[model samples]
Structure formats: structure tokens, C-alpha cells
Target: KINLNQIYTAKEMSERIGKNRNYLSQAYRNNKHEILKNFNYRKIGGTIIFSDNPNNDLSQLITAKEASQLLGKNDEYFAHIYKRFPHRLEGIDHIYTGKTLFLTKESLEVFKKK
Candidate 1:
């Protein structure tokens, strides 16, 4: 039997992974880095739930905050940069509740190269 608490919503993943809600949603929407490829997920009536596995590798797709840390930039540095290119970030915002989410690593490399 599956433990219900193990299933997490977008907001839960945001808090757990330290990502913005939009970024998380974007990562899921884009299916980037196979973020949800290895995991178990269930979609019910437009609500998507994910299995929260601590050991699962979600590294390929990470939020700006996580990428900033990986890049040795200040915490909010990437956050500010992302705001300039919100659409390019590729995340979704919930209509009723209003949440935004997304993720990236290669983009950071590209940004760094320039």
C-alpha cells in the first residue's frame, strides 16, 4: 500500500526542493531532465500529485535558487535574473490558486558563457 503523505502536490515539492511553485510546475510541464520520468505520479481531475522520494535524483532539473547555489551566486541573484525573462523560463501559473514554477541547468551554463 502507498503512504498518502508520500504523495506531494506542486506546493509541497516547492517547499521540499526549495524551488518556486512556478518553477516546479514548469519543470513538470516541460518534462525537463526527465524530472518526473522516474517517479510515480497521479493526475486526478486536473490535480497532479507526485511521489516525494528524497533519494530520487531531480538534479538535472533544478530551480533558479538551487542553480544559483551550484553556480556560487548569491541566493537571490538568479531570482532577479529570472524575473527579466519570465516567459523564457518556461513555467506555468495556476489560474485559481496562482502559483508559478520552473527549472533549468543548461540555461545557466549558457548564461555563464555569455
Candidate 2:
């Protein structure tokens, strides 16, 4: 059973790692250390860990936010590409009654149709 509350902001992550609040962010910026850079993180909502994502775990579905990060693009960019290349997103995104849904990281790797 995975706990959604397992999520944490950048500040919380640093503290859990027993470091300064700005340590993770700074580490990401300066690039002097490979500390947190060797993992998946989200810039949205003040930075987030991917939650041991994309491993042999049973959790296969990922959020729009996660999908965007996996593709190394911001959420805003997803909308643009979605419209231009709906075919690429086929069988990938899951939209329910509301606007929120999940995506598969496996479906994220798309090359230009050209």
C-alpha cells in the first residue's frame, strides 16, 4: 500500500536527508555534487520526489506532472505538444470525468513524426 502523503516539498526532503532547507535546491543549481541530481524530482509545488517511481513497483500510473517531468518539459509544454501531436499521446493519457488523470512513462518516449 502506497501512501500519497509520502509526498514532500523540497524543504521537507532536505530535512529528511538531514540537510539545510536550501541544500537540495542549491545542490541542483550549483551542480558541484551529484547528490539529488541522480534522481527524479518535480519543480511544481516547490519541488517533489518522484516517489521511487518507474521501478519494479506495482504503481504503473503516473500523474500529468510526473509525465511532464519525465519528458524533461514543463506542464505548459505538454499542452502544446498534445495538440500538435495527438497521435503521439494516443493510448498514453487517461482523462476521466474531470480534467485530472494519469499517464504512463513508457508512452512518454516519442520521436518527431518527421
Candidate 3:
């Protein structure tokens, strides 16, 4: 019983939840976990759209560009960093295109400390 307007992309959800979109996508695909069951989701035009869930705490994710801005570096700086420390950039690859996208919060935290 959710509104169509409430649908949001996995990337948008990641921004709100501060979690990796890939991880969330995996969880949604599994659909066995109780927490995962809390939200309604649908795959539309190769992208997953999730329904609004009031129970979830919402926050914007820190992206590499934003992280670089915070650290006074160029935007592309983190793209190079991604090549060196792929593990630190937890994220998902596009299903069709195979382009990788990173969730920068944890990576930035680790990067900042280094």
C-alpha cells in the first residue's frame, strides 16, 4: 500500500541509509531477511526502485566528490584512489554496463585517517 511517487532508486536509498547500494540490492534480492522485508521494491527499466520506509533512519551518503571537497582535493582525485584501494570503496557494479560505483562514507573515513 505505497504510493507510486514514493519510489526511489537504490542509489537514492544508499544516500539516505548510508549503506552500500550493492549490499542493499543483494539484501533486496534475497528477500529472506526480516529487515529487508520491511520495504517494498520493484525492478524497473534495469534500476531498482524502493518504497518509502518511515522506520529507516535517513541520511545522505558522502560521495567521493564530496569527500574530495572536504579534503581540499580535486574531484577526480578519489577516482584514482578507487583504483588503488578498491576494497575500501564498497559498492556495486552496474548489471548491464558493469560500471562500478562506490559508497564513499566508510572509504572516506578510512582515507581521512590515512
Worst 10 residues of 3 by lDDT: 92-101
TM values, all candidates: 0.39, 0.38, 0.37
Query: Which runs in model 3 stand beyond 4 Å of their true positions?
Result: 1-60, 87-107
Report lDDT (Cα) of residue 9, candidate 3: 71
RMSD of each: 13.5, 9.4, 12.3
Displacement of residue 9 (Cα, Å) in model 2 is 0.9
lDDT of 2 by residue, 63-107 (tens): 666677766889755555565766666745333212433444454
Q: Candidate 3 on 1-114: residue-level lDDT in tens? A: 222234467766655677776766777678757866666555443556565765322222334456667789998666676678665544421111113232334445666675
**CA lDDT of each candidate?**
0.52, 0.51, 0.52
Ranking by lDDT: 3, 1, 2
Candidate 2 stretches greater than 4 Å from native: 38-40, 45-114
Higher-scoring candidate on lDDT, 1 or 2: 1
Candidate 1, position 81, lDDT:
57
